[PDB]
PDB file of C-alpha atoms and ligand atoms in Angstrom:
ATOM      1  CA  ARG A   1      18.059  -1.153  14.802  1.00 16.22           C
ATOM      2  CA  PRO A   2      15.135  -1.367  17.270  1.00 18.24           C
ATOM      3  CA  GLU A   3      12.365  -0.273  14.898  1.00 19.07           C
ATOM      4  CA  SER A   4      13.582  -2.531  12.059  1.00 17.19           C
ATOM      5  CA  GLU A   5      12.796  -5.510  14.303  1.00 16.87           C
ATOM      6  CA  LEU A   6       9.408  -3.970  15.205  1.00 17.38           C
ATOM      7  CA  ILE A   7       8.560  -3.846  11.452  1.00 17.51           C
ATOM      8  CA  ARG A   8       9.950  -7.309  10.753  1.00 15.99           C
ATOM      9  CA  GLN A   9       8.041  -8.949  13.647  1.00 18.91           C
ATOM     10  CA  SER A  10       4.717  -7.216  12.856  1.00 18.33           C
ATOM     11  CA  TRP A  11       4.892  -7.925   9.114  1.00 20.42           C
ATOM     12  CA  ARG A  12       5.340 -11.714   9.738  1.00 22.50           C
ATOM     13  CA  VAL A  13       1.702 -12.389  10.660  1.00 25.51           C
ATOM     14  CA  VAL A  14       0.271 -10.084   7.938  1.00 22.78           C
ATOM     15  CA  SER A  15       2.551 -11.502   5.229  1.00 25.09           C
ATOM     16  CA  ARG A  16       1.161 -15.006   5.805  1.00 23.79           C
ATOM     17  CA  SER A  17      -2.061 -13.986   4.055  1.00 22.57           C
ATOM     18  CA  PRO A  18      -1.374 -10.890   1.933  1.00 23.51           C
ATOM     19  CA  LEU A  19      -4.608 -10.981  -0.109  1.00 22.11           C
ATOM     20  CA  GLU A  20      -6.836 -11.220   3.015  1.00 22.81           C
ATOM     21  CA  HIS A  21      -4.979  -8.370   4.694  1.00 25.26           C
ATOM     22  CA  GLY A  22      -4.697  -6.335   1.460  1.00 25.67           C
ATOM     23  CA  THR A  23      -8.469  -6.603   1.023  1.00 25.99           C
ATOM     24  CA  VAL A  24      -8.903  -4.876   4.448  1.00 23.36           C
ATOM     25  CA  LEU A  25      -6.510  -2.119   3.331  1.00 23.48           C
ATOM     26  CA  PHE A  26      -8.433  -1.445   0.063  1.00 20.39           C
ATOM     27  CA  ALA A  27     -11.877  -1.727   1.615  1.00 14.26           C
ATOM     28  CA  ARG A  28     -10.747   0.923   4.153  1.00 15.07           C
ATOM     29  CA  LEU A  29      -9.253   3.060   1.326  1.00 14.44           C
ATOM     30  CA  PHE A  30     -12.510   3.299  -0.618  1.00 12.84           C
ATOM     31  CA  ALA A  31     -14.467   3.972   2.541  1.00 14.07           C
ATOM     32  CA  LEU A  32     -12.262   7.002   3.235  1.00 14.42           C
ATOM     33  CA  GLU A  33     -11.819   8.233  -0.384  1.00 14.26           C
ATOM     34  CA  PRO A  34     -14.494   6.801  -2.793  1.00 13.13           C
ATOM     35  CA  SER A  35     -13.191   9.022  -5.634  1.00 12.50           C
ATOM     36  CA  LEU A  36     -10.269   6.568  -6.092  1.00 10.21           C
ATOM     37  CA  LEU A  37     -12.606   3.769  -7.358  1.00  9.83           C
ATOM     38  CA  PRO A  38     -12.762   4.967 -11.037  1.00 10.10           C
ATOM     39  CA  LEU A  39      -8.986   4.911 -11.381  1.00  9.97           C
ATOM     40  CA  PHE A  40      -9.093   1.081 -11.755  1.00  9.41           C
ATOM     41  CA  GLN A  41     -10.178   0.520 -15.339  1.00  9.45           C
ATOM     42  CA  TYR A  42     -10.029  -3.105 -16.383  1.00  8.52           C
ATOM     43  CA  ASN A  43     -11.666  -4.258 -19.618  1.00 10.44           C
ATOM     44  CA  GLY A  44     -12.507  -0.598 -20.405  1.00  9.56           C
ATOM     45  CA  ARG A  45     -15.015  -0.331 -17.504  1.00 12.59           C
ATOM     46  CA  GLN A  46     -15.394   1.638 -14.230  1.00 15.29           C
ATOM     47  CA  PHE A  47     -16.410  -0.153 -10.974  1.00 15.09           C
ATOM     48  CA  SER A  48     -19.724   1.321  -9.721  1.00 15.19           C
ATOM     49  CA  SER A  49     -19.330   0.355  -6.026  1.00 13.86           C
ATOM     50  CA  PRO A  50     -16.445  -0.700  -3.825  1.00 14.93           C
ATOM     51  CA  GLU A  51     -17.801  -4.303  -3.549  1.00  9.83           C
ATOM     52  CA  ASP A  52     -17.547  -4.493  -7.427  1.00  9.78           C
ATOM     53  CA  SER A  53     -13.728  -4.173  -7.160  1.00  9.26           C
ATOM     54  CA  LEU A  54     -13.522  -7.229  -4.854  1.00 10.43           C
ATOM     55  CA  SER A  55     -15.063  -9.468  -7.606  1.00 11.45           C
ATOM     56  CA  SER A  56     -12.389  -8.475 -10.181  1.00  8.73           C
ATOM     57  CA  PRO A  57      -9.435 -10.878 -10.593  1.00  8.68           C
ATOM     58  CA  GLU A  58      -7.311  -7.989 -11.963  1.00  5.05           C
ATOM     59  CA  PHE A  59      -8.119  -5.807  -8.975  1.00  2.00           C
ATOM     60  CA  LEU A  60      -7.270  -8.654  -6.594  1.00  2.00           C
ATOM     61  CA  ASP A  61      -4.008  -9.206  -8.540  1.00  2.00           C
ATOM     62  CA  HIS A  62      -3.176  -5.510  -7.864  1.00  3.44           C
ATOM     63  CA  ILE A  63      -3.756  -6.096  -4.107  1.00  3.83           C
ATOM     64  CA  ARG A  64      -1.088  -8.852  -4.284  1.00  6.80           C
ATOM     65  CA  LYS A  65       1.225  -6.436  -6.220  1.00  2.64           C
ATOM     66  CA  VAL A  66       0.810  -3.760  -3.518  1.00  2.00           C
ATOM     67  CA  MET A  67       1.587  -6.277  -0.751  1.00  3.35           C
ATOM     68  CA  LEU A  68       4.699  -7.543  -2.589  1.00  7.63           C
ATOM     69  CA  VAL A  69       6.042  -3.952  -2.806  1.00  6.14           C
ATOM     70  CA  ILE A  70       5.492  -3.513   0.933  1.00  7.11           C
ATOM     71  CA  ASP A  71       7.258  -6.890   1.457  1.00  7.65           C
ATOM     72  CA  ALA A  72      10.231  -5.461  -0.481  1.00  9.50           C
ATOM     73  CA  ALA A  73      10.242  -2.357   1.760  1.00  6.03           C
ATOM     74  CA  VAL A  74      10.401  -4.604   4.859  1.00  3.90           C
ATOM     75  CA  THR A  75      13.185  -6.688   3.276  1.00  4.53           C
ATOM     76  CA  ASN A  76      15.108  -3.414   2.686  1.00  4.24           C
ATOM     77  CA  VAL A  77      14.017  -1.699   5.938  1.00  3.88           C
ATOM     78  CA  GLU A  78      17.645  -0.972   6.981  1.00  6.69           C
ATOM     79  CA  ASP A  79      18.447   0.795   3.662  1.00  9.35           C
ATOM     80  CA  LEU A  80      15.641   1.948   1.354  1.00  7.73           C
ATOM     81  CA  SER A  81      18.130   3.642  -1.014  1.00 12.02           C
ATOM     82  CA  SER A  82      18.387   0.439  -3.028  1.00 12.01           C
ATOM     83  CA  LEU A  83      14.642   0.584  -3.851  1.00 11.27           C
ATOM     84  CA  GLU A  84      14.596   4.300  -4.727  1.00 11.94           C
ATOM     85  CA  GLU A  85      14.713   3.892  -8.500  1.00 12.45           C
ATOM     86  CA  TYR A  86      12.057   1.210  -8.624  1.00  8.69           C
ATOM     87  CA  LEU A  87       9.826   3.327  -6.375  1.00 10.59           C
ATOM     88  CA  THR A  88      10.339   6.490  -8.476  1.00  9.28           C
ATOM     89  CA  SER A  89       9.199   4.683 -11.613  1.00 12.40           C
ATOM     90  CA  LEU A  90       6.222   3.174  -9.704  1.00 15.70           C
ATOM     91  CA  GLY A  91       5.300   6.793  -8.848  1.00 14.45           C
ATOM     92  CA  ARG A  92       5.496   7.833 -12.547  1.00 11.24           C
ATOM     93  CA  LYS A  93       3.224   4.871 -13.483  1.00  8.01           C
ATOM     94  CA  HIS A  94       0.646   5.891 -10.849  1.00  5.14           C
ATOM     95  CA  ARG A  95       0.746   9.562 -11.875  1.00  3.57           C
ATOM     96  CA  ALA A  96       0.065   8.272 -15.460  1.00  4.22           C
ATOM     97  CA  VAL A  97      -2.961   6.243 -14.353  1.00  4.99           C
ATOM     98  CA  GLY A  98      -4.299   9.354 -12.607  1.00  8.44           C
ATOM     99  CA  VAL A  99      -3.548   8.990  -8.907  1.00  9.13           C
ATOM    100  CA  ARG A 100      -2.802  12.295  -7.106  1.00 10.89           C
ATOM    101  CA  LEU A 101       0.264  12.225  -4.873  1.00  5.33           C
ATOM    102  CA  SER A 102      -1.850  13.398  -1.917  1.00 10.76           C
ATOM    103  CA  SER A 103      -4.031  10.230  -2.224  1.00 13.47           C
ATOM    104  CA  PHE A 104      -0.972   8.256  -0.981  1.00 10.95           C
ATOM    105  CA  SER A 105      -1.525   9.740   2.530  1.00 14.76           C
ATOM    106  CA  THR A 106      -4.967   8.043   2.595  1.00 12.85           C
ATOM    107  CA  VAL A 107      -3.263   4.827   1.509  1.00 11.45           C
ATOM    108  CA  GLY A 108      -0.927   5.263   4.506  1.00  9.23           C
ATOM    109  CA  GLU A 109      -3.868   5.656   6.884  1.00  9.09           C
ATOM    110  CA  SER A 110      -5.394   2.507   5.319  1.00 10.05           C
ATOM    111  CA  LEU A 111      -2.183   0.515   5.824  1.00  7.29           C
ATOM    112  CA  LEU A 112      -1.944   1.649   9.478  1.00  8.10           C
ATOM    113  CA  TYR A 113      -5.622   0.790   9.958  1.00  9.61           C
ATOM    114  CA  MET A 114      -5.062  -2.734   8.605  1.00  8.60           C
ATOM    115  CA  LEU A 115      -2.041  -3.295  10.865  1.00  8.34           C
ATOM    116  CA  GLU A 116      -3.945  -1.943  13.909  1.00  9.34           C
ATOM    117  CA  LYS A 117      -6.885  -4.356  13.222  1.00 12.38           C
ATOM    118  CA  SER A 118      -4.631  -7.400  12.638  1.00 14.21           C
ATOM    119  CA  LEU A 119      -2.180  -6.832  15.499  1.00 16.50           C
ATOM    120  CA  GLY A 120      -4.652  -5.639  18.152  1.00 21.27           C
ATOM    121  CA  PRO A 121      -2.913  -5.242  21.517  1.00 20.91           C
ATOM    122  CA  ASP A 122       0.422  -5.865  19.751  1.00 21.82           C
ATOM    123  CA  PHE A 123       0.092  -2.597  17.781  1.00 23.35           C
ATOM    124  CA  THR A 124       2.140  -0.580  20.267  1.00 21.25           C
ATOM    125  CA  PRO A 125       2.682   3.163  19.793  1.00 22.90           C
ATOM    126  CA  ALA A 126       6.308   2.348  18.825  1.00 20.81           C
ATOM    127  CA  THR A 127       4.940  -0.019  16.152  1.00 24.43           C
ATOM    128  CA  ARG A 128       2.702   2.715  14.727  1.00 27.54           C
ATOM    129  CA  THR A 129       5.634   5.170  14.653  1.00 27.74           C
ATOM    130  CA  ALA A 130       7.941   2.645  12.978  1.00 27.56           C
ATOM    131  CA  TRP A 131       5.436   1.924  10.193  1.00 28.04           C
ATOM    132  CA  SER A 132       4.621   5.640   9.722  1.00 31.18           C
ATOM    133  CA  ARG A 133       8.356   6.274   9.169  1.00 37.82           C
ATOM    134  CA  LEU A 134       8.804   3.354   6.746  1.00 38.72           C
ATOM    135  CA  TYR A 135       5.662   4.180   4.699  1.00 36.20           C
ATOM    136  CA  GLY A 136       6.749   7.836   4.754  1.00 35.11           C
ATOM    137  CA  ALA A 137      10.055   6.940   3.127  1.00 37.30           C
ATOM    138  CA  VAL A 138       8.398   4.741   0.490  1.00 37.97           C
ATOM    139  CA  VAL A 139       6.124   7.643  -0.457  1.00 37.11           C
ATOM    140  CA  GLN A 140       9.041  10.106  -0.533  1.00 36.86           C
ATOM    141  CA  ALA A 141      10.788   7.825  -3.065  1.00 37.59           C
ATOM    142  CA  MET A 142       7.580   7.477  -5.118  1.00 34.65           C
ATOM    143  CA  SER A 143       6.955  11.248  -5.038  1.00 36.27           C
ATOM    144  CA  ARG A 144       9.995  11.730  -7.326  1.00 34.03           C
ATOM    145  CA  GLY A 145       7.861  10.206 -10.137  1.00 36.22           C
ATOM    146  CA  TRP A 146       5.543  13.226 -10.065  1.00 33.10           C
ATOM    147  CA  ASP A 147       7.792  15.528 -12.200  1.00 34.00           C
ATOM    148  CA  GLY A 148      10.327  15.351  -9.362  1.00 33.08           C
TER     149      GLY A 148
HETATM  150  C1  HEM B 201      -3.916   5.186  -4.325  1.00 31.21           C
HETATM  151  C2  HEM B 201      -4.012   3.862  -4.387  1.00 31.21           C
HETATM  152  C3  HEM B 201      -3.617   3.108  -5.681  1.00 31.21           C
HETATM  153  C4  HEM B 201      -4.281   3.068  -6.862  1.00 31.21           C
HETATM  154  C5  HEM B 201      -5.585   3.803  -7.236  1.00 31.21           C
HETATM  155  C6  HEM B 201      -3.513   2.220  -7.767  1.00 31.21           C
HETATM  156  C7  HEM B 201      -3.804   1.886  -9.071  1.00 31.21           C
HETATM  157  C8  HEM B 201      -2.987   1.133  -9.908  1.00 31.21           C
HETATM  158  C9  HEM B 201      -3.189   0.970 -11.337  1.00 31.21           C
HETATM  159  C10 HEM B 201      -4.340   1.581 -12.163  1.00 31.21           C
HETATM  160  C11 HEM B 201      -2.211   0.189 -11.817  1.00 31.21           C
HETATM  161  C12 HEM B 201      -2.073  -0.230 -13.309  1.00 31.21           C
HETATM  162  C13 HEM B 201      -3.036  -1.397 -13.581  1.00 31.21           C
HETATM  163  C14 HEM B 201      -2.653  -2.641 -12.818  1.00 31.21           C
HETATM  164  O1  HEM B 201      -1.654  -3.316 -13.187  1.00 31.21           O
HETATM  165  O2  HEM B 201      -3.355  -2.987 -11.835  1.00 31.21           O
HETATM  166  C15 HEM B 201      -1.334  -0.167 -10.706  1.00 31.21           C
HETATM  167  C16 HEM B 201      -0.215  -0.977 -10.785  1.00 31.21           C
HETATM  168  C17 HEM B 201       0.664  -1.332  -9.774  1.00 31.21           C
HETATM  169  N1  HEM B 201       0.585  -0.964  -8.424  1.00 31.21           N
HETATM  170 FE1  HEM B 201      -0.921   0.349  -7.678  1.00 31.21          FE
HETATM  171  N2  HEM B 201      -2.434   1.749  -7.067  1.00 31.21           N
HETATM  172  C18 HEM B 201      -2.439   2.263  -5.807  1.00 31.21           C
HETATM  173  C19 HEM B 201      -1.491   2.000  -4.856  1.00 31.21           C
HETATM  174  C20 HEM B 201      -0.367   1.203  -4.944  1.00 31.21           C
HETATM  175  C21 HEM B 201       0.686   1.223  -3.962  1.00 31.21           C
HETATM  176  C22 HEM B 201       0.665   2.140  -2.711  1.00 31.21           C
HETATM  177  C23 HEM B 201       1.623   0.332  -4.338  1.00 31.21           C
HETATM  178  C24 HEM B 201       2.936   0.027  -3.588  1.00 31.21           C
HETATM  179  C25 HEM B 201       2.922  -0.589  -2.407  1.00 31.21           C
HETATM  180  C26 HEM B 201       1.189  -0.290  -5.579  1.00 31.21           C
HETATM  181  C27 HEM B 201       1.835  -1.276  -6.324  1.00 31.21           C
HETATM  182  C28 HEM B 201       1.631  -1.477  -7.673  1.00 31.21           C
HETATM  183  C29 HEM B 201       2.495  -2.246  -8.559  1.00 31.21           C
HETATM  184  C30 HEM B 201       3.774  -3.004  -8.145  1.00 31.21           C
HETATM  185  C31 HEM B 201       1.852  -2.161  -9.947  1.00 31.21           C
HETATM  186  C32 HEM B 201       2.384  -2.776 -11.274  1.00 31.21           C
HETATM  187  C33 HEM B 201       3.068  -1.557 -11.904  1.00 31.21           C
HETATM  188  C34 HEM B 201       3.606  -1.686 -13.321  1.00 31.21           C
HETATM  189  O3  HEM B 201       2.871  -1.953 -14.305  1.00 31.21           O
HETATM  190  O4  HEM B 201       4.808  -1.448 -13.476  1.00 31.21           O
HETATM  191  N3  HEM B 201      -0.026   0.266  -5.925  1.00 31.21           N
HETATM  192  N4  HEM B 201      -1.848   0.422  -9.531  1.00 31.21           N
HETATM  193 KR1   KR B 202     -12.154  -2.898  -1.906  1.00 28.51          KR
HETATM  194 KR1   KR B 203       5.643   0.384   3.826  1.00 25.62          KR
END
């Protein structure tokens, strides 16, 4: 595949520091959709502001979890079938915690934003398209968890 290599090569730099890069993605997410902030309840409390979430070890742990799932999508970029079941159940979990399926589009824009900022001139239109397709397929798999 051509695009599989585009994903592999562009993930290499980001994957060296997943928490740093993940923090960009979530900062961008709350700037676009602040109504997602209350969905992260740790120790029975709601974060008041987006900067509150960045001081929470549990929230930062979830950033690393998100990045590891994306790492698994890249590893299986040539055949995402083998992750379908895991992704479906991850969708069910997120539905249970209160995330609306449509919020995953904003997550996609946040991921693309983070890649654009990290890669700079190396974020070619083919690289955007490749990532849009891969994230699209991840979300399709996850969408099964919302009653099908
Ligand atoms: C809309 C943005 C998202 C919100 C509000 C959200 C929120 C949550 C919450 C509340 C949990 C349960 C508490 C925890 O363990 O932290 C969770 C778990 C988790 N999240 Fe997310 N999440 C989002 C996006 C994602 C995405 C896009 C991925 C995939 C790349 C992901 C990967 C994971 C994983 C692997 C877990 C552990 C699941 C388990 O207990 O089985 N998260 N998330
Ligand atoms: Kr954040
Ligand atoms: Kr992805």
